[PDB]
Ligand binder design. Structure first.
Ligand SMILES: CCC[C@@H](CC[C@H](Cc1ccccc1)NC(=O)[C@@H](NC(=O)N(C)Cc1csc(C(C)C)n1)C(C)C)NC(=O)OCc1cncs1
Ligand code: HEM
Length: 458
C-alpha cells in the first residue's frame, strides 16, 4: 500500500510502516514541503500514515484540480477527524450538501452587503483606537492577538448576527475565551497524532460521541446562537443569520445553522486577528514600509478622514502590504482535494483515493517564482508586477468554487482596521518581541511566541 507512488513512477521520500512520512513533520510540515519541492521537483508523493498524498506544483495542474474538475472529481477536502454535527459545516461538508450550503451562504458577502458593513466596522475601529491609546499612554507591551482578537470577534458577531457583545471593553469575554479553545490541533497531541496517522479510528470515536472540538465550547456556541437567533425572530438588515432563517421558512436544520455559525465565528476571529498580527509584526520590523504606508493613508484620507468602501480600494500600497504578508504567512499552509475517481490531468495519471495537495507555503516561497523569496518586499505586488504573479502559484485564499467565501470581507475588514490604527499609531519592536519571528511547529499558522509590540502616538 506504501508502494503506490513507486508503482505509479512518482518520486517521493521513503515511508516507514504505519507512520508513513509523518515523522518528517517534526521540523514543521512546511519545511517538509519546501524540502520535498527542492529535492523532487514539481510533483512528489508521500503518506500521512496510510493516507497517500500527491503533492503538485505545476500551475495548470493546480487550475485543473482547483477549478475545472471541482464538481466532477475534486469536490471535497480531506476528511480529518471525529466531527459530529459539525460534519455539516460548509468547509467540512461534502458534495451535494456543500453545493447547497455554498449557494445558500454565498450571497452573504456581495458588494451591496459589504458596503453596508462599513459603518458598523468603523464603530469598532474607533473603540480599537481608544483601546490602543491606553496602551500607548503607558508604553506597555501589547499582545497584538489579544486586542485584534477582541476587535475581530466584535466585527464578525455584529456583521453576522446583528449583535453587540462589546468584546473590546470586556477582558474575560466568554466569546473570545471559548473560541480560541475551539480548535487546538497539535502534532504533539497523541489524539491528533493518532487520528492524523490512523484514520480507521475515527468512526469508532463518532459513536462514542467523541469529537475534535471540545464539548464545553460547542455547547456554549450552540446556546449562544440559539439565543441570537431567538432574538432575531422576536424583533419587530439582511445578514448571514437572516439568510439562514429564510431557508428554514432542503431544508436547514437548527444544528446545521449553528455549524455554519461556528465556522464564521472562527474565521472572523482567529484568521482575521492572526493576519493582522503578522502584518503589524512586519510593519514594526520594517519602519520605512510602515512610514510609506502611513503616507498613502494620509494622501487618500487627509485630516484623519474616515475610510469608506472606495477609499479602502484606492489604496495600492496598503493592498501591497497585505498581499505580501499573506504570501509569507498563508493561513492555509496547504490546499487539499480528495481525488474521487481515476483521472488523467496534464498527461498524468492520478488514482481514486489520493489526496491531491497544493503546498501554498512552499509555492509562496519558491526561488523559481520569487527573487529573494524569503524577505518582506511589498513592491513585488505592484500594479506593474501584477501579471508577473501567477494566480495558481499565489493562492492565499485558494481558488475555484471552493475558495474562501469570506475573502473580500476579510480584506475589507483588515484594511479598515489597518487604516484606523496607522492614522493614529506607530508599532515598534521591544525586548519582549521575538525577532526573527519563529512559527509554531504544531498546528495552524501561529507564532511560537505571541506577537508583542509597543504602541507610539503621532
Ligand atoms: C472550526 C475549525 C474547523 C477547521 C477544520 C477544517 C480545516 C480545513 C480548512 C482549512 C483552511 C480553510 C478552510 C478549511 N482544517 C484545518 O484548518 C487544519 N489545517 C489545515 O489547513 N490543513 C489541511 C493542513 C494540515 C495540517 S495537519 C494535516 C494532516 C497531516 C492531518 N493537514 C487543522 C486541523 C490543522 N476549519 C475551518 O472551519 O476553517 C474556516 C476558515 C475559512 N477561512 C479561514 S479559516
Ligand atoms: C485573512 C483571513 C482569511 C484567510 C487567509 C482565509 C483563507 C481561506 C483559504 C485558503 C480557504 C480554502 C480555499 C481552498 O480550499 O481553495 C478558505 C476557505 C473558507 N473560508 Fe476563508 N480565509 C480567511 C477569512 C475568512 C472569513 C472572515 C470567512 C467568513 C466569515 C471565511 C470563510 C471560508 C469558508 C466558509 C471556507 C470554505 C468554503 C468552502 O469550502 O466552500 N474565511 N479560507
Amino acid at each position: 500500500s506504501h508502494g503506490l507512488f513507486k508503482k505509479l513512477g512518482i518520486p517521493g521520500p521513503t515511508p516507514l510502516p504505519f507512520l508513513g512520512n509523518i515523522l518528517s513533520y517534526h521540523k514543521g510540515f512546511c519545511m517538509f514541503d519546501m524540502e520535498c519541492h527542492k529535492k523532487y521537483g514539481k510533483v512528489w508523493g508521500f503518506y500521512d500514515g496510510q493516507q497517500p498524498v500527491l503533492a503538485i506544483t505545476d500551475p495548470d495542474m493546480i487550475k485543473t484540480v482547483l477549478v475545472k474538475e471541482c464538481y466532477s472529481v475534486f469536490t471535497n477536502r480531506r476528511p480529518f477527524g471525529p466531527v459530529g454535527f459539525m460534519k455539516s459545516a460548509i468547509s467540512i461538508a461534502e458534495d451535494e450538501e456543500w453545493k447547497r450550503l455554498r449557494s445558500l451562504l454565498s450571497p452573504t458577502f456581495t458588494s451591496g452587503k459589504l458596503k453596508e458593513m462599513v459603518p458598523i466596522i468603523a464603530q469598532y475601529g474607533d473603540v480599537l483606537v481608544r483601546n490602543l491609546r491606553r496602551e500607548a499612554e503607558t508604553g506597555k507591551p501589547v499582545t497584538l492577538k489579544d486586542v485584534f482578537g477582541a476587535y475581530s470577534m466584535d466585527v464578525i458577531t455584529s456583521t453576522s448576527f446583528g449583535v453587540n457583545i462589546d468584546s473590546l471593553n470586556n477582558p474575560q469575554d466568554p466569546f473570545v475565551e471559548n473560541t480560541k479553545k475551539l480548535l487546538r490541533f497539535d502534532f504533539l497531541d497523541p489524539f491528533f497524532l493518532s487520528i492524523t496517522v490512523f484514520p480507521f479510528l475515527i468512526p469508532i470515536l463518532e459513536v462514542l460521541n467523541i469529537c475534535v472540538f471540545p464539548r464545553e465550547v460547542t455547547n456554549f456556541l450552540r446556546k449562544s446562537v440559539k439565543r441570537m437567533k431567538e432574538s432575531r425572530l422576536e424583533d419587530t438588515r439582511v445578514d448571514f443569520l437572516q439568510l439562514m432563517i429564510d431557508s428554514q421558512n432542503k431544508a436547514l436544520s437548527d444544528l446545521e445553522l449553528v455549524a455554519q455559525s461556528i465556522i464564521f465565528i472562527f474565521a472572523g476571529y482567529e484568521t482575521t486577528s492572526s493576519v493582522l498580527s503578522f502584518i503589524m509584526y512586519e510593519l514594526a520590523t520594517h519602519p520605512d514600509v510602515q512610514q510609506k504606508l502611513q503616507e498613502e493613508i494620509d494622501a487618500v484620507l487627509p485630516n484623519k478622514a474616515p475610510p469608506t468602501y472606495d477609499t479602502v480600494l484606492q489604496m495600492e500600497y496598503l493592498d501591497m502590504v497585505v498581499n505580501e504578508t499573506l504570501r509569507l504567512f498563508p493561513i492555509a499552509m496547504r490546499l487539499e482535494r480528495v481525488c474521487k475517481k481515476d483521472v488523467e490531468i496534464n498527461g498524468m495519471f492520478i488514482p481514486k483515493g489520493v489526496v491531491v495537495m497544493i503546498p501554498s507555503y512552499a509555492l509562496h516561497r519558491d526561488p523559481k517564482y520569487w527573487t529573494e523569496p524569503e524577505k518582506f518586499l511589498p513592491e513585488r505586488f505592484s500594479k506593474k508586477n501584477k501579471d508577473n504573479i501567477d494566480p495558481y502559484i499565489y493562492t492565499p485564499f485558494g481558488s475555484g468554487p471552493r475558495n474562501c467565501i469570506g475573502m473580500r470581507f476579510a480584506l475589507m475588514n483588515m484594511k479598515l482596521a489597518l487604516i484606523r490604527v496607522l492614522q493614529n499609531f506607530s508599532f515598534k519592536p521591544c525586548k519582549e518581541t521575538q525577532i526573527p519571528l519563529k512559527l509554531s511547529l504544531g498546528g495552524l499558522l501561529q507564532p511560537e511566541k505571541p506577537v508583542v509590540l509597543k504602541v507610539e502616538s503621532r
